[PDB]
Design a binder for this molecule. Structure first.
Ligand SMILES: [Mg+2]
Ligand SMILES: [Mg+2]
Lengths: 436, 434
């Protein structure tokens, strides 16, 4: 009566690893989605189910997840006779069939793939663009194009350099529109590539998983100066600001923090959380840093709360919250942060990710929709960030098409929305104040 | 027939603007995007760029988009020709431009419409795109290509000392295309590990095509690295090596400089004969089965001499630039035995199909090719199957502007079912399987 067919297969993601793609068929046609993947397993993440056969793709095959869709999830959904518009009921049906709290039986990658395909097929049955269907599933009316946060400089475990902080990003908060923000981002990206080529050599301009550069930078402040200089030389000093992903859990060491964790271990150099907090206040004074992700360890709750109570910038939970609602509730209760990173495959279904998002927003938080380091040609999260009206998305450098595919789709959405398109701009934290 | 044609500016995989085209018929919306091209080639179809330094550092494509929206779109809608009539639609755009290299509207403007028309035509004929392409080309067979995976980079766009531009791997002995992706990915990841140990984490960042560029000086060192990864991955029997030398990049004073990236001195330059001698040692000592642009784009006597003296595939890229008059000359003088087919170098579906059939009539192989700047578009995946050329090079199995083509080939193979055939060891002449 609704779903004609559901067929899953194994494709390759942007790192050359297998992942789940799902085809769903209705009288309106073929609706296809693919699943992203992080670099490592997180303890609070919903389970990404992998084959573990070390011969085939080093044990990263997803044949087990694909067979669960084709042999179990697909018949159950078709036989339920539920319409594809009933996102919550079909999601609930899969959560019940799985019957585990972390989706360890089918894998969040199996369950998500169907959830995304159902959402796409539901939008066509409603005769709505995907982003408007999502807005209705979430209870929004006034769509917003987000500020993109473009990865440009990498450190931490992403790089062989001494730089201990993981990612430095640029946000074109001063752009006139989302299409204008893509232009400002690309021009600074290329300006910065030129600067790196001259200062560090041609070798220093190859790219990492998310399309950013990882030159041999030694000091965290030298990276910030590099980014500031590319923005200034591109001519956009006041229109482009900086975001950072510290990923502080990476250099967390016995209750302290090792800002040189890639040099031979020396405990005497570890600094306390309060010492790390003071270093951030110096960055925020000397550089236009408006957002910091994971400034402290994912269990260092006391440091988060003290920093968030004492600075006025955006403080993003990533490893702290893990798109996990029980963790979010504790983070809200302790005022640990004021923005949620939203990674849909960390929670495993469209419904639960919309609920995670409404949990944060109803408590005054920003929400930044996020990519994974292993992405696909899928663009679902571009429609998601518009429908959820969060005003901010980080989905890579303006380089590599698993990133540009999202940005290109957002420009198409802006074009479709026309005179009713509102760009979040300097209100990326609170886009609700914009619409009239 | 065509309800609407609407072009917009999008960003390609390097972050530069390119042309995307929406085409509406009564069957729905058909979307296609154009890869990065050259705007100043001498034989190439030329892409139109804006050159407005206030926008994308002069790289905008607003002019091309305007040519589509203001001129090509009403003309083609006015024609009343159905979307199936690929060749009549393509000739109309060719006549409207009225230049051989498409420098009025831009090769990027003409191709984007051409691709969108083709996708609309498939649906109108109730055929998947690759079957529609087979019919436009006169083919009744369908063959999955052997993929050529870029893995190591040198030449002009790598900061190392390696003169030669790209080393690829071809899983000729895989059981199918799906198996061929597994083999290529597993060797690619093995290589990443070898490179991280030998050279360091930083040396595993990727170039435009997803391949690596560690700091190696001699080309033999690069070939050993590929062989070592193939070996450790366990596929010495199943994977061979392709090369793209891009020798035009180091052609100096009628001679060849294999250290052109280091401070100059003509004393170290070597003749075409000496370069050909080194290729023969390469072919003797490593499983190299294909070499692209071994000599300069106009050193015709070096091409003809080398091709007469080896058994391997010799691919023209800068030699032929997908240009029929350049191709005829290469045929005449036996310069090479394989055409690298870059569809945006020619400018339309119909012309690219003609160029491919021209090479194939003369016993040449045809290698369908990506560009440095690609998009999420997957057209060339359906193209290489529809033309049955048996080989495609569209990147390392890394970066999704590359994997999108490869993933689409896996989908096509699953659709073909028991009819799906993998070119395998006949990647040069897939027609022996017909
Ligand atoms: Mg993070
Ligand atoms: Mg070439």
């Amino acid at each position: 009566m609704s779903i004609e067919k559901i067929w899953a297969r194994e494709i390759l993601d942007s790192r050359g690893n297998p992942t789940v793609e799902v085809d769903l068929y209705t009288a309106k046609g073929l609706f296809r989605a693919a699943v992203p993947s992080g670099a490592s397993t997180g303890i609070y993440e919903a389970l990404e189910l992998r084959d573990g056969d070390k011969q085939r793709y080093l044990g990263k095959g997803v044949l087990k997840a694909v067979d669960h869709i084709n042999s179990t999830i697909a018949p159950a959904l078709i036989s339920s006779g539920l319409s594809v518009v009933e996102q919550e009921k079909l999601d609930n049906l899969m959560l019940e069939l799985d019957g585990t709290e972390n989706k360890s039986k089918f894998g969040a990658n199996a369950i998500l793939g169907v959830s995304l395909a159902v959402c796409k097929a539901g939008a066509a049955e409603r005769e709505l663009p995907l982003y408007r269907h999502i807005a209705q599933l979430a209870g929004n009316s006034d769509l917003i194009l987000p500020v993109p946060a473009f990865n440009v400089i990498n450190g931490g475990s992403h790089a062989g350099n001494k730089l201990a902080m993981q990612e430095f990003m640029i946000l074109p908060v001063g752009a006139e529109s989302f299409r204008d923000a893509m232009r400002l981002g690309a021009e600074v990206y290329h300006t910065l590539k030129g600067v790196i080529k001259d200062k560090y050599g041609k070798d220093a301009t190859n790219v990492g998983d998310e399309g950013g550069f990882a030159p041999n930078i030694l000091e965290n402040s030298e990276a910030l100066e590099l980014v500031k200089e590319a923005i200034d030389k591109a001519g956009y000093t006041e229109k482009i600001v900086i975001g950072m992903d510290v990923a502080a859990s990476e250099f967390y060491r016995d209750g302290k923090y090792d800002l040189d964790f890639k040099s031979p271990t020396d405990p005497s150099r570890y600094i306390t959380g309060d010492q790390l907090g003071a270093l951030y206040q110096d960055f925020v004074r000397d550089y236009p840093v408006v957002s910091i992700e994971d400034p402290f360890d994912q269990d260092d709750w006391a440091a988060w709360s003290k920093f968030t109570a004492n600075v006025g910038i955006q403080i993003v939970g990533d490893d702290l919250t893990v798109t996990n609602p029980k963790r979010i509730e504790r983070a809200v209760e302790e005022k640990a942060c004021n923005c949620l990173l939203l990674k849909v495959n960390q929670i495993g279904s469209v419904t639960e990710a919309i609920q995670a998002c409404k949990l944060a927003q109803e408590n005054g938080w920003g929400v930044m929709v996020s990519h994974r380091s292993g992405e696909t040609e899928d663009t679902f999260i571009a429609d998601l960030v518009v429908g959820l009206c969060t005003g901010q998305i980080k989905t890579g450098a303006p380089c590599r098409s698993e990133r540009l595919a999202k940005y290109n789709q957002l420009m198409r959405i802006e074009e479709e929305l026309g005179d009713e398109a509102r760009f979040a701009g300097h209100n990326f934290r609170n886009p609700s104040v914009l619409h009239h």
